[PDB]
Design an enzyme around this catalytic site. Sequence first.
Site, PDB file in Angstrom:
ATOM      1  NE  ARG A  54      -2.982   2.063   2.909  1.00 58.01           N
ATOM      2  CZ  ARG A  54      -2.918   2.520   4.529  1.00 58.01           C
ATOM      3  NH1 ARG A  54      -2.541   2.324   5.238  1.00 58.01           N
ATOM      4  NH2 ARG A  54      -3.749   3.754   4.547  1.00 58.01           N
ATOM      5  CG  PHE A  59      -0.271   9.002   4.258  1.00 55.85           C
ATOM      6  CD1 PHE A  59       0.075   9.793   5.389  1.00 55.85           C
ATOM      7  CD2 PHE A  59      -0.978   7.881   4.182  1.00 55.85           C
ATOM      8  CE1 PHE A  59      -0.218   9.168   6.684  1.00 55.85           C
ATOM      9  CE2 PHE A  59      -1.487   7.172   5.477  1.00 55.85           C
ATOM     10  CZ  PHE A  59      -0.876   7.897   6.485  1.00 55.85           C
ATOM     11  CD  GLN A  62       0.368  -0.622   5.965  1.00 54.97           C
ATOM     12  OE1 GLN A  62      -0.295   0.474   6.091  1.00 54.97           O
ATOM     13  NE2 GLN A  62      -0.368  -1.572   6.620  1.00 54.97           N
ATOM     14  CG  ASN A 101      -1.966   0.259  15.106  1.00 61.02           C
ATOM     15  OD1 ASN A 101      -3.183   0.672  14.528  1.00 61.02           O
ATOM     16  ND2 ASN A 101      -1.171   1.135  15.999  1.00 61.02           N
ATOM     17  CG  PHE A 112       3.506   3.712   8.417  1.00 60.31           C
ATOM     18  CD1 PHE A 112       2.871   3.119   9.791  1.00 60.31           C
ATOM     19  CD2 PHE A 112       3.504   5.039   8.450  1.00 60.31           C
ATOM     20  CE1 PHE A 112       2.304   3.919  10.775  1.00 60.31           C
ATOM     21  CE2 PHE A 112       2.796   5.801   9.505  1.00 60.31           C
ATOM     22  CZ  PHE A 112       2.527   5.192  10.506  1.00 60.31           C
ATOM     23  CG  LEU A 121      -0.349   8.745  11.337  1.00 63.24           C
ATOM     24  CD1 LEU A 121       0.408   8.246  10.198  1.00 63.24           C
ATOM     25  CD2 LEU A 121      -1.781   8.058  11.286  1.00 63.24           C
ATOM     26  CG  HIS A 125       0.022   4.239  13.812  1.00 70.57           C
ATOM     27  ND1 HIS A 125      -0.363   3.087  13.378  1.00 70.57           N
ATOM     28  CD2 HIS A 125      -0.981   5.004  13.511  1.00 70.57           C
ATOM     29  CE1 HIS A 125      -1.624   2.977  12.878  1.00 70.57           C
ATOM     30  NE2 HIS A 125      -2.029   4.134  13.053  1.00 70.57           N
TER      31      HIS A 125
END
EC number: 5.2.1.8
Lengths: 164, 164, 4, 4
Positions: A54, A59, A62, A101, A112, A121, A125
């Site tokens: 992904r 951004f 991942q 997660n 990521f 975030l 995370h």
Amino acid sequence: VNPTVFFDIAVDGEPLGRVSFELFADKVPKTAENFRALSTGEKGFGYKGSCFHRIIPGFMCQGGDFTRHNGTGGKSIYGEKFEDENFILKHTGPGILSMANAGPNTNGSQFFICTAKTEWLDGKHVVFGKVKEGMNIVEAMERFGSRNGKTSKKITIADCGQLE
Amino acid sequence: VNPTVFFDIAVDGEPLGRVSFELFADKVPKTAENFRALSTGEKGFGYKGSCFHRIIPGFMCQGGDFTRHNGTGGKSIYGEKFEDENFILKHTGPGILSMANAGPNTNGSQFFICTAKTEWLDGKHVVFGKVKEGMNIVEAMERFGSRNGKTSKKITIADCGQLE
Amino acid sequence: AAPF
Amino acid sequence: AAPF
């Protein structure tokens, strides 16, 4: 003292470059040991030959699902999932390596690499490492991803291990 | 037929401009009416004089808490908070007027106007409208927000009503 | 609180 | 699934 691991990245089998990571084992030790051990493959299973499933330009990238290869799997060296170790370190910029997660205390093996500052975030995370060498290899990877994450070519961890 | 409501915006009392929205009453009638009713003030409470409290440039402008003014309030015309009507409409681009919430079925009065395409929010926020005119005013507003959303100047809905 |  |  803090371990350093590398990833030799590949785009459909053509070698692309090496990203190396400093793992902050002095603040997030159990999180850093799990990424270190999965990179060496010393516990029998790991990242070598898994792909970034992904990639969202601007951004993060991942990856780490070595069991199901699509974000629904992966497992840690402590069992399938473990606690959020702590939230000392924050998402301050590109190159920060943080744990993916499925809500709190669900860390496995997905991680990521941020390619931007993602302060939203924080607190959700665990951050446990940062790119040391290779950030333009992470940046070039963005071009093979999309707004929704789907990547256009297979991007793999061709080899990985510990350097120091 | 679909209502068109408007907001006249002011930055610390200095009037910026008007934004007018089309509310998609034919697909989300209960959510569209909540926003219309609060734009006219016909039930005795509503948006006029409230502020946009969270502006994150390149993402969205969020407003509508007219009770606590900080993002912990708002109340709808049905009695504090209602259910997510449906998710027919997607956050396809700049312009989308969508409902803020605190998880499923917590819709009160807070809304946000997208300045980017935010496909990660689909299925989690009800979309019910679009900027019909004044989208550059919504862009000019971004000048007074931050990565974390705090605004630098007081951005208010100086007046609001229904056009058609 | 959302959107995140 | 996260980060969102």
